[PDB]
């Protein structure tokens, strides 16, 4: 069920990503406004994943290294013994930094792809 994994640890809750994604787009003027806004939220999250090179994926790996100053916590203290609700507080002030780094890395990677396809 939706949010069923909310109290589970991060490494367990990561297995219900389809459940959560599946119900985000689909669960007088104000009803119309509610629908338009739900679409806008959906698209902003999808655009952002596309910019980072994660279009079409629920789990994606990038080339931005984890900077330990963002969390100062090791493995098995994050993917276990912790839930996503808590993790979302542990790094709440580094979100914009990470997002900017993700956008920069993807732009550099696309340029490198374009050159390899011309050079080879």
């Amino acid at each position: 069920g939706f949010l069923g994994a909310a109290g589970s640890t991060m490494g367990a809750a990561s297995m219900t990503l389809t459940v959560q994604a599946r119900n985000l787009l689909s669960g007088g003027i104000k009803q119309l406004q509610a629908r338009v806004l739900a679409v806008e939220r959906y698209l902003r999250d999808q655009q952002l994943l596309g910019i980072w090179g994660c279009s079409g994926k629920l789990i994606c790996c990038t080339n931005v290294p984890w900077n330990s100053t963002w969390s100062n916590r090791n493995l098995s203290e994050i993917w276990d013994n912790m839930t996503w609700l808590q993790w979302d507080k542990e790094i709440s002030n580094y979100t914009q930094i990470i997002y900017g780094l993700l956008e920069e890395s993807q732009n550099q990677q696309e340029k490198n792809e374009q050159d390899l396809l011309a050079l080879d």
Partner: protein, 410 residues
């Protein structure tokens, strides 16, 4: 050797204020056009606050808005702001009804602009004010009076508030929850369950009962500016009636414009009243007091706050509760009631409604499921809805997040 890994569909949320929608000739049945699932969340602790809850504010706004849309397309009774010629109602009338009803005659318009008619009708004392035997309707001073359309039902039916996609409603299931602070028994729901938009003062009717004990709740206990909402453990059954067998007359006042006037009472004339069992009421207060001790007659304002405002059968009652709250702690009780036809709802002053008369005799039985105390009080309305919505909060779902993993792209 950790890398940023991006996840989408992460089960997290933030508190949020969004618009909820309603789901199910009644006004709410017509409005709540959407037809009508609970998921337990193990190990989720959440903070609730019934005194800071946008769901209550939206319900209040929706009720006012619906009411206005309902009255908008109805007869506007401005032809009645004339001097009325009024005498007392007599003949088979009891001692308790003397001066309660008046028989008013007046010069009214007709369907043609060049014709006039003389008509008469009965009014309750509360609706008619002197200005000799010359009277006017009480609101032919500050605003127009709109006649409610007789076909329209304002009977409360249960309605459900439902979240839009991207949002969820979290429900607090803890027993003995006092409207604030952490809740450890939490579940996610699609909608708020069936909440009946019952409008009343002092006594809350047809609400939810507490599971085990009477629950005392307030925004700031030991303040004096706040009301105490008491949720009862058991219901108290209250039997109300308007015993007079009445009739109606339809008067045409324009091109298809009808006014519904109170006709002669065709039976005997008696006073409206409400009954409760005496022991049930005494036990109920004893339980409330037992709980008040764990923490340690109405007066002031108009009938709308000093009496028990009550809608029964579509009629508007103003009942005297001094018979219920007259005891210091340390077969039945009868409450006399007044009836009023010109109603100014929700403390608004620019609007007024004329409640058409109802034929025959009105009887209803209601459940007292809670009290508003301050010594009875209330009349705020938002506080009535807080008694059903105290267990719900709306949260925004936030699907993206990042975390360190050992997975590198390529």
């Amino acid at each position: 050797n950790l890398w940023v890994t991006v996840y989408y569909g992460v089960p997290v949320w933030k508190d949020a204020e969004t618009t909820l929608f309603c789901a199910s000739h009644n006004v709410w049945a017509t409005h709540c056009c959407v037809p009508t699932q609970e998921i337990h969340l193990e190990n989720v602790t959440e903070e609730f606050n019934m005194w800071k809850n946008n769901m209550v504010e939206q319900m209040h706004t929706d009720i006012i808005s619906l009411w206005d849309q309902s009255l908008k397309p109805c007869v506007k009774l401005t032809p009645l702001c004339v001097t009325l010629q009024c005498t007392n109602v007599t003949n088979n009338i009891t001692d308790d009804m003397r001066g309660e009803l008046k028989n008013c005659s007046f010069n009214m318009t007709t369907e043609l602009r060049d014709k006039k008619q003389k008509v008469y009708s009965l009014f309750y004392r509360l609706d008619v004010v002197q200005i000799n035997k010359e009277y006017r309707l009480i609101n032919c001073n500050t605003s127009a009076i709109t006649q409610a359309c007789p076909k329209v039902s304002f009977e409360p039916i249960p309605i459900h508030y439902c979240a839009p996609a991207g949002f969820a409603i979290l429900k607090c299931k803890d027993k003995k929850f006092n409207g604030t602070g952490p809740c450890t028994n939490v579940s996610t729901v699609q909608c708020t369950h069936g909440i009946k938009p019952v409008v009343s003062t002092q006594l809350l009717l047809n609400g939810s009962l507490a599971e085990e004990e009477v629950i005392i709740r307030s925004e700031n206990i030991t303040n004096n500016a706040k009301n105490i909402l008491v949720q009862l453990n058991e219901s108290v059954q209250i039997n109300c009636t308007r015993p007079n067998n009445n009739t109606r007359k339809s008067i045409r006042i324009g091109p298809g414009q009808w006014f519904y006037a109170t006709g002669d009472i065709i039976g005997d004339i008696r006073q409206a009243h409400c009954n409760v069992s005496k022991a049930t009421w005494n036990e109920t207060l004893g339980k409330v007091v037992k709980q008040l001790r764990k923490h340690f007659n109405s007066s002031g304002g108009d009938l709308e706050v000093t009496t028990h405002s009550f809608n029964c059968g579509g009629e508007f009652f103003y009942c005297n509760t001094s018979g219920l709250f007259n005891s210091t702690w340390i077969d039945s009780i009868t409450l006399p009631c007044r009836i009023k036809q010109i109603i100014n709802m929700w403390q608004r002053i620019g609007q007024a409604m004329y409640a058409p008369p109802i034929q025959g005799v009105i009887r209803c039985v209601s459940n007292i499921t809670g009290l508003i105390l301050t010594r009875p009080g209330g009349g705020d309305m938002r506080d009535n809805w807080r008694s059903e919505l105290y267990k719900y909060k709306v949260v925004k779902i936030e699907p993206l997040g990042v975390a360190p993993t050992r997975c590198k792209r390529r």
